[PDB]
Symmetry: D2
Subunit: 259 residues, 4 copies
């Protein structure tokens, strides 16, 4: 099978990468970073997010694996000590796969993006006012610092810091959280996080300024003359190679409660 | 068809009830409060919750309808002015039905209950400490005022006041929120609301005191010698007669944003 | 000087108490639990709160000291290893004193209480609705689980779990936090914690039910036919014997950040 | 007396300004925008904030007055209908004055600023990590979107949207709130708002990046090679001309509860 390995670039991750390549050399496995069917990320969740976006046009043909050489990650959830066992079981194939939902972001001026964690919209220069439209009905006029739309696996990241709920990634949904909303006699927002099912479309529309900072995972670019930002659960999914059982709620416990 | 009408009991709801019965008398419709196939609640969401529990053993054979004679409700979402149109379309049948998920609560000392809004566990006398177990793995030791497990349609009720997310009721899930959790060098909880899919089981287990106040919707009873409280999405669903399109997110907007 | 020592009652605290009494026996110090001028609490913050209330009628004549035989406390902030040094410096006198503000609670049916942490008002049986009146002007009609009025040193306790601010105890103020307030088309509360200076009077007044559960620190009693609950910063203060410098913000850091 | 009037610049505020100048022309009152002793702001709270900063070097010699030609403001709290009565009572003098505390911000690379609402520190490009030091002791390493330090009268503004407490402006304090803090196995922050008395110094210190966006009220500038940001309650105060009794808590009620 064709495989590739990305590295955070520090000494630990690079040497683990070279060792796994050597281990793969003892099997019917070909290193190919153009059309791999297995993508191994060695580093942290940030390294994994970059590997996902490096290959987001071949998502249906790739099984992803994350190894954490630092603290436990939610995508980088296997320890370096297990790398030799990962080489053997990856080479045999026949492992199971698990799929997590993704967020589709459409920016009309169109450009479309996939997020594994979230997409956010923030004020560029000055106040941030957007009309929030849900399935073509005007829901609220938001004024504040910004808005965050999270995938299920993204709920443990930015979403969590904004008061959002943690959602098991088997649920096909997206979650919208507020950043420092104003509420007074003029403006009124819902306050609570909002959780949307598949096929629901949330549209952000400018009121005055048409320039915002729009993020998709780690990528953050200033977008000019934007007329609309549309969010919906993607029809595409990210696929993980299933090594063993590491339940989502145990990863939550190990990351935030104790380990 | 067999039908029954429950009333909040004030002048407005009682006379609307008598008028609808008279209107139903002009059709092939029989008043039966033992085995109705249509249950109409006239009052508020509290009146509707009582109608649901009056007939929770025949849920699969009943279509519920709520009329609000006060402010707009989330279950009582039709106005008294539409009552004559409701009589005509209910008598013809062939209306569509919509189903919302329910929460199954099991109390072991077993007793099982269904909630349309939520079930909560609170301290009876003294401090509240419970071990939270998710799918048989210990997740956290909670110390504080209590815990709330909400259905999707319950998310706009107690859940909302506790910081929970609002979830569209097409999502088959339950949501767990904390009430005033202690977090210091001794105890540690997740803080965030937790959203669980079907077939996930959340178990609350006593640490010292075995007496708690357990609520299911409006019913709140003191339960002695409790050994466990188990939550999971019910296999049963409540069925609403679908009169017209009143989207969930519009009901959210009308109730909390403006109307 | 007259002194007394209270104990949590476990083996550790009792034997530390007996050892300190023996150490005090080597000085001009008399054990008196009727009119002590020095009150030493050995246990935790709960033990200290009970010592404060045991002697709250002689607050102006007592310097309090707390020793924690378990985890660090905010009132019980000296370690057992320092007990022999505490005996020597307490016997000499001439130590400095520090004073923390207290909360005066008046319950009219009058009865008055002093709180070192907080006083709370909760629903007894059924819904909790109270009118909140600030300096005789109606501020809000609160509906929800209850309200909490905290001293500065209480802000790290119940107040913290309810989202309240942590206030340095040199500030003469009280802080009001909400417990699970309802906000919809009917009811409207401020949401935010409220911080009041001296001489401001916050009055809670019943709307329907006149029975509530009222707490003052660890004491919680059901109060019948209550017509009003009045909160204001007390003119009385608790006095601590100042052993050395242990800044409030360092106690916050050691308790909640790391130690 | 020397007076000046600033205007939001819309038709309503400009014509009200010209009418008040005409009214002042009937008294011993001289228009001077260089050394006024009375500064009248006509517009909203934003207009008032700009008037404060236009004259922040003569604060001890100026009494400020705010008139709101739109919705009620917290500084612009008098209605246009009262303008003719304001002219008469301002011309006589002998009115009372009320003083609100201010926040002193020191930026070391030094530059010092006064805030009437708040000062905030946010990430410029990339992640935001700062060490928080309280009275020279390291309190926490904050990672997240930013931090906000509010005056008492600022607590109803940005501070409120970030979960901060509302503080009566007679309290000489400042309040620190977090913006989307990360909390996991790596980082740990207090979470709660922090309220500091006079003479307490809160210092923000860079960890990696030394470039941040620093705001003081409406002014927001990018500051390069910053080594420290120091916050403390200013020794200076803003003085308002006291027209009549409009209590702070009533302004809170009228702005956020109902009016
Ligand atoms: N104010 C804010 N509060 C919270 N989060 C904020 C935030 N601003 C931005 N963000 C998040 O940063 C992401 C971009 O940085 C790469 C990443 C990531 C990531 N993914 C997850 C996830 N799914 N669950 C849990 N932790 C996750 N991290 C970890 O977040 C940290 C980096 O932020 C590191 O500890 C990562 O772990 P590691 O790389 O060290 O292993 C964005 O996508 C956004 O979510
Ligand atoms: N501290 C607390 N904060 C918030 N909620 C609290 C709460 N303690 C208890 N509860 C909720 O009470 C329920 C029991 O009272 C009957 C009901 C109901 C109900 N259902 C919903 C729903 N799905 N969405 C939105 N509003 C709903 N209400 C409305 O809540 C109010 C009554 O509480 C009335 O306005 C009801 O509207 P009406 O009857 O006047 O039409 C419990 O089940 C629990 O949820
Ligand atoms: N849902 C709730 N969330 C949070 N707090 C809640 C709460 N319900 C009630 N409460 C608080 O209990 C108090 C009554 O119990 C005695 C006490 C105390 C106390 N004082 C302080 C303080 N000033 N700062 C910080 N920790 C403090 N504790 C510690 O709280 C714990 C006991 O609750 C123990 O760890 C105590 O430490 P220790 O005894 O083990 O040393 C009430 O007064 C109320 O505040
Ligand atoms: N995410 C955010 N969430 C909340 N607030 C945020 C914020 N980002 C920035 N800010 C605040 O803006 C200020 C700069 O804009 C000028 C101002 C002001 C102001 N002062 C107060 C005050 N003391 N109490 C209550 N409302 C106040 N406003 C009103 O806020 C609105 C403008 O933001 C207008 O309604 C103002 O009213 P008006 O001008 O229409 O009369 C900053 O200083 C900061 O506080």
């Amino acid at each position: 099978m064709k495989y590739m390995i990305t590295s955070k670039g520090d000494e630990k991750s690079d040497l683990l990468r070279l060792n796994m390549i050597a281990g793969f050399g003892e099997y019917d496995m070909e290193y190919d970073d153009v059309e791999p069917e297995i993508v191994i990320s060695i580093g942290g969740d940030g390294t994994f997010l970059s590997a996902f976006h490096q290959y987001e046009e071949r998502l249906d043909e790739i099984a992803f694996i994350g190894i954490h050489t630092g603290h436990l990650g939610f995508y980088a959830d296997w320890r370096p000590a297990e790398a030799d066992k990962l080489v053997k079981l990856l080479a045999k194939g026949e492992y199971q796969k698990v799929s997590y939902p993704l967020l589709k972001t459409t920016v009309k001026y169109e450009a479309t993006y996939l997020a594994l964690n979230e997409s956010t919209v923030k004020s560029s220069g000055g106040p941030f006012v957007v009309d929030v439209v849900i399935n073509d009905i005007h829901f609220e006029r938001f004024r504040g610092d910004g808005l965050c739309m999270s995938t299920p696996s993204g709920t443990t990241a930015y979403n969590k810091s904004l008061g959002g709920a943690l959602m098991h990634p088997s649920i096909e949904a997206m979650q919208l959280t507020e950043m420092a909303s104003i509420n007074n006699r003029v403006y009124r927002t819902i306050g609570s996080p909002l959780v949307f099912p598949k096929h629901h479309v949330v549209s952000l529309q400018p009121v005055n300024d048409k320039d915002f900072q729009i993020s998709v995972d780690h990528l953050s670019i200033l977008h000019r003359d934007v007329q609309e930002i549309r969010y919906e659960v993607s029809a595409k999914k990210i696929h993980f190679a299933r090594f063993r059982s590491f339940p989502f709620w145990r990863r939550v416990h190990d990351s935030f409660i104790e380990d």
